[PDB]
Structures are given as structure tokens and as C-alpha cells.
Design a protein around this ligand. Structure first.
Ligand code: GO1
Ligand code: GO1
Ligand code: GO1
Ligand code: GO1
Lengths: 343, 343
């Protein structure tokens, strides 16, 4: 839709992004070799995903700014900020794949898993983060929302990191203590680790660029966006298992990874002492035979029906939030995103 | 001296720092467990060093600001910014110890080497970095140099990271290609990886807080400070081997670590085809028998005498730089630091 058509101008802008970032070496050939490594890090990790978060910034910017103030310069900045979001994303993914010892990402081998990279990816990840601020300075240094965007990107990083800490404490590599897999802990992890930077950040960035720096307007948008983010992750957890790999384009590994999935949280709320024991001896195992056992326990608890019920109640709640907190912003900004998330 | 006496008020301020950072959880008990982990990360990694960089900020601030504008509030901010520098330092050390697989740091076991930590330290390191900006916001949000400090900390991180990339490309874990151990590469690594954040950052921060935001004044201070930083690292490399472990409080491991030391760079410039071969078969080995062989080759090339000559020429050059670029700043600011570095 609005994404598929705008996606072209976005992905194609990457070339200028990479150029602008790897062009400070012109004045300092001494770090040329480092800049070449940086370019390789950018091309490998910032490219290959769906660019939903970055596109949201562009899309939201056009709906929040009058068609006359949408000069080529303003649009170039919108694309850049959208790419900054993707760079923040790349920063998290590269670091996260190392921390949980992942093998692949976006279909390809994890950056750190490439021969000659390994733990050096920790520094590569840090450089991705730094590029964010280099771009903001280069393209928005003179804009009146400059400081607001810097603070937004910083806060988003902190929240994500705080959420990552929480997740690491909740599901320690090895320990399958299902006791900490509570609903309040799950919602808190989703809020900090995913919702803030995935759904609030993009619209907030667009809002600031549109001149909407009101602290109240941001609180209202955030109210709506964090709820959308929570549903998004809950749906993602559901589809991870009960989803169709040919449609989703991915195979479920949440159970095997001992993840604090929404499904496992629900299963723990709707389970008899014996059912619990069944989960403890099958959760976090590679053996498909054990995995199928967990999935079997989920269906029996009618989780797929529970999710269906939650999805309808969730949608209603989002429409109410939009109808109540959208203004003075165009409801479409939120409706467009919602429609995209809810299947 | 000015450090030993001021060091008390600095280290003692840490308690407030930790308190202020782990107090946002009061409004969000949901992340309490994460905040507890953050506190543990701070206490373990930001404490235990010499605090030279952070103290430099405090020391330089008092010499750049009139005794009347040194109210309790201004001094508290100076201490905080000095701690932000230490936090940036902690961020680099934690990440660097993982990347080069170090065992100990500041006498104690490396954070990531502690049971239950491991690669999670990558996120811990990122949180240290984030605390920097949380503190600046909390203490300097209203100050007119707020944006300048944010940009300074960001640029310093980028430079350090770019310098880290260079170092990683120069001495790949395993590859002992002595061909890339050139003087120009060594100086470039020192400049980016160490000098900028170690010697320019601290005084620059003080300068901005004192209202000295002149782009020319910063370029002049940087001119002096990067030269001091280069000598510092060259001296550090020299002492790493020819230093007295009881006085330095550390044992040399540069040769064993295949580091791009200043000594090895000099040895490569003053060596016969046969001497080179001797270095290639003994550099980067744990065997003390091989290490002693390298050290033996250094003395024979009279490197200790070369360093002595360089140290005197270096000192003269620094005094000339100070006499030429210090103004309008108090020469003492630079003289004090220099005296501290040159033994
Ligand atoms: O891109 C992703 O990581 C997941 C994802 C999907 C999706 O998987 O269809 N869709 C998204 C939308 Cl509409 C918005 C945002 Cl902010 C993220 C996503
Ligand atoms: O679990 C992991 O982190 C490693 C891993 C990845 C992957 O990393 O892409 N993919 C997996 C799949 Cl499809 C199935 C199983 Cl049973 C394990 C994995
Ligand atoms: O603290 C360190 O890492 C090394 C170090 C030493 C020293 O080792 O004596 N002295 C320093 C001085 Cl005076 C200034 C700065 Cl900025 C760093 C150092
Ligand atoms: O080289 C390393 O990175 C590990 C290491 C550390 C350390 O990590 O503290 N310290 C060492 C010493 Cl004192 C001697 C040797 Cl032969 C190796 C090491």
C-alpha cells in the first residue's frame, strides 16, 4: 500500500546514506580502512529487512506535514531519519544475535557468524549506533527539532536496553524457571524491549519533524502506540507457532529458545499441576518430538481461541484509544499502522 | 596533587550518581529488576580505576571558571560530567575486554568473565553508555552548553569506535602480519582510539561548561591535547615492557598480545632482515622464553634510548604547543596535565 509504493524511494536512498557516512574519510584517509569496514557493516546489516519502522517515519511525515512544506529538502531529511531508525534496529539485531548465539538473521548468516568477524561485531554494532547521530547532525543540525530527535533516539535506545536486560533476567540462558514467566513481566518486556522503539519512535520522530513537539500530544500518541506494540508482539508470538511458515516466511523457534512467549504465559495461567510438569520437561528443547508436545498442550488449552478473543478485544480497544487520543493528529496516521498490524 | 585532594569529593559523589540513575524505577517498579542489574553493572565497572579522565574535568573546570560562578550547583554538574567521562570509559573497557578475551581488569575478574554474565555484558556495556546521556539530561538539560556536551560525548564515542575498528584490522586475532604495523597506522590508532576521549574530551567538556564554546579555541586545545595523548600512549607502550611492575602496578603483556605497540613499530624500522625473522617467530607468544627474546632484540636496537630521546623532544614540542595555542586559556590547564603524564 502506502508502504509498497514509498518503499522504493526509501531503499534507493540508502546509497546516499552510505555515501554520506563513508565520506568523512576524504578528509582523513588515515581511517580509510576503518571506513571501508563501516561500509561493509552498513550494507550487510542495515539492508535485508522489511524497513517497516523506517518507512513508518516517511509515511507518517507526509500525513503530518502540509504538502507545501514537503520540499525536496524536508523529504530527504524524512528519509534520513527513517534510515536512522533502521540503523538503530540494525544496532540491536547485531548485538542481540551475538548475545543469544543466533545462527541466522533475515535469511542470511548472522554478521558475527561470518569468518573474520566474531566478537568484533560488538564494535561494529556500536558504529551502527553512532551513524545514527552522525546523520542527524549532517541533515538536521540546523532544524529546530534537532535536539528533540537526539533525545528521542537516546531514550529509545535506553528503553530497548532496559527491556533487553529484563528479558535476559527473565529467561537466563539455560535456567527454565517458569516462575518468572508472568503476564506483568511479559508486558513489561514487550513495552521496553519492543514497543517503544518499534511503534512509538517512528511516529514520534515524524511528529517532531512536523513541528509537533507538544509533550501532551506525544503522551497521547505514545498511549496509542504502546498498545499497538503490545498487540503486535502478542500476535507475533502466536504466529511464531500457529503461523504458516510459507506465509510468514519464517519457522517457529520460540519454544526451543525457551522464550518468554505470550503463549507460554497463557499456558501457565490455564494449566493443571500435571500440565505444568509437561511444559517443564518439554520447553526449551531442540527435539521436535518435545516441541510438538508443547504445541499439543497449547491447543488443548484452547490458546488459539484465547488469542482470537484477545485480538478482537484488542482491536476494539485500539479504535477507542484512537478515537480518544488521536486528535489533534490525523486518525489515519494510527489507523494506517493498525490495519497493517492486524493481519 | 590537585587530583589527590579533589579525588575524594569525586569518588564520594558516585553514590549520588548511582542513586540518581537507579531512581527512575520509583515511577516504574516494573523494571526494578533491570535497574538492580544496572546498579550492579555501575558499581562493578565504573569503580576501581584511577579516575584520571573524570578528575581532569573537575580540575579543568575550576581553573577555567571564576571562583564566584563556582556555586554548589555548578560544581555538582562538573562532578557529574566528570563521571560521564568515567562511564564512557567503563563502556569501552567492558566491551573491549570481551572483544579481546581478556581475563582481568583493574586487578579483578573482567565483568563478562563473572559467572552468570558472559555475553550479556554487551547489553550491560550499552547501558553504561546510555547512563551518560541520562545524567547530562538530568543535570544539564537547562544549561546553554547542553547540546555541546551531548555532541562531544557522541563524537568521542564514534572516534574511539573508529579507532577500535582500525586497531582490530591492524592486529587481527591470530594474524601476525607485521606489515601493517607502520608508524602512520600506529599514530592514527592512538589518535582515534585513545587520545580524543582520554585527553581532548575531559578539557573540552570543562571548556564548554565554562562557556568556552569557540570553535577556534577547541581546535587549539585539541591540537595540544592530541599531542599529549600520543606521547602518553607511546610512554605507556614503553613502560609496558621496560617498566617496573612494582611501580607501574601492572605486568607487561603487549608482546604476548601481539599488540601494535610503539616498541614493535620502532623495532620494525630499525631491524635487519634477520632481526625481522626473529620478531616474527617470537611476537605474540605466551612462552616467557620467546617474550624475553623479543625484549632482548629491543634493547639491542637501543629502543630504550630512542624512547628517551623521543620523550625529551616530545616534551619540548608540547611546551611550544602550549606557549603557542594555550591562550586565551590558562597555560596551567595544560601544564598541569603534562606534568602528570611525563613521569
Ligand atoms: O518488521 C518487523 O520487524 C515486524 C513487523 C511486521 C511484520 O512482521 O509483518 N509488520 C510491522 C509493522 Cl506494520 C510495523 C512495525 Cl513498526 C513492525 C512490523
Ligand atoms: O535457536 C537458535 O538461536 C539457532 C536457530 C536458528 C537461528 O539462529 O536462525 N534457527 C533455528 C531453527 Cl529454524 C531451528 C532450531 Cl531447532 C534452532 C535454530
Ligand atoms: O588512567 C589511565 O588509564 C592512564 C593514565 C595515567 C597513568 O597511568 O598514570 N595517567 C593519566 C593521566 Cl595524567 C591522564 C589521563 Cl587522561 C590518563 C592517565
Ligand atoms: O593476554 C590476555 O588477554 C590474558 C592475560 C591477562 C589478562 O587478561 O588480565 N593477563 C595476562 C598476563 Cl599477566 C600474562 C599472560 Cl602471558 C596473559 C594474560
Amino acid at each position: 500500500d502506502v508502504y509498497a509504493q514509498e518503499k522504493q524511494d526509501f531503499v534507493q536512498h540508502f546509497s546516499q546514506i552510505v555515501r554520506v557516512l563513508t565520506e568523512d574519510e576524504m578528509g582523513h584517509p588515515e581511517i580509510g580502512d576503518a571506513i571501508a569496514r563501516l561500509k561493509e557493516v552498513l550494507e550487510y546489516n542495515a539492508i535485508g529487512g522489511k524497513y517497516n519502522r523506517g518507512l513508518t517515519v516517511v509515511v507518517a511525515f507526509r500525513e503530518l506535514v502540509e504538502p507545501r512544506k514537503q520540499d525536496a529538502d524536508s523529504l530527504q531529511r524524512a528519509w534520513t531519519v527513517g534510515w536512522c531508525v533502521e540503523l538503530l534496529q540494525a544496532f540491536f539485531l547485531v548485538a542481540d544475535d551475538i548475545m543469544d548465539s543466533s545462527l541466522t538473521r533475515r535469511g542470511q548468516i548472522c554478521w558475527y557468524q561470518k569468518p573474520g568477524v566474531g566478537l568484533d561485531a560488538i564494535n561494529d554494532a556500536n558504529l551502527l549506533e553512532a551513524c545514527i547521530y552522525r546523520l542527524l547532525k549532517l541533515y538536521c543540525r540546523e532544524q529546530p527539532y534537532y535536539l528533540n530527535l537526539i533525545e528521542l533516539f537516546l531514550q529509545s535506545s535506553y528503553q530497548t536496553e532496559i527491556g533487553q536486560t529484563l528479558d535476559l533476567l527473565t529467561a537466563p540462558q539455560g535456567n527454565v524457571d517458569l516462575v518468572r514467566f508472568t503476564e506483568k513481566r511479559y508486558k513489561s518486556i514487550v513495552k521496553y524491549k519492543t514497543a517503544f522503539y518499534s511503534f512509538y519512535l517512528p511516529i514520534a520522530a515524524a511528529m517532531y519533524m512536523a513541528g509537533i513537539d507538544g509533550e501532551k500530544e506525544h503522551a497521547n500518541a505514545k498511549k496509542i502506540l504502546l498498545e499497538m506494540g503490545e498487540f503486535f508482539q502478542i500476535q507475533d508470538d502466536y504466529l511464531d507457532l500457529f503461523g504458516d511458515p510459507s506465509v510468514t516466511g519464517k519457522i517457529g523457534t520460540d519454544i526451543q529458545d525457551n522464550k518468554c512467549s505470550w503463549l507460554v504465559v497463557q499456558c501457565l495461567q490455564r494449566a493443571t499441576p500435571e500440565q505444568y510438569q509437561i511444559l517443564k520437561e518439554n520447553y526449551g528443547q531442540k527435539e521436535a518430538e518435545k516441541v510438538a508436545r508443547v504445541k499439543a498442550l497449547y491447543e488443548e488449552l484452547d490458546l488459539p481461541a484465547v488469542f482470537l478473543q484477545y485480538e478482537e478485544d484488542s482491536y476494539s480497544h485500539i479504535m477507542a484509544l484512537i478515537e480518544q487520543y488521536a486528535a489533534p493528529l490525523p486518525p489515519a496516521v494510527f489507523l494506517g499502522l493498525a490495519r497493517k498490524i492486524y493481519k
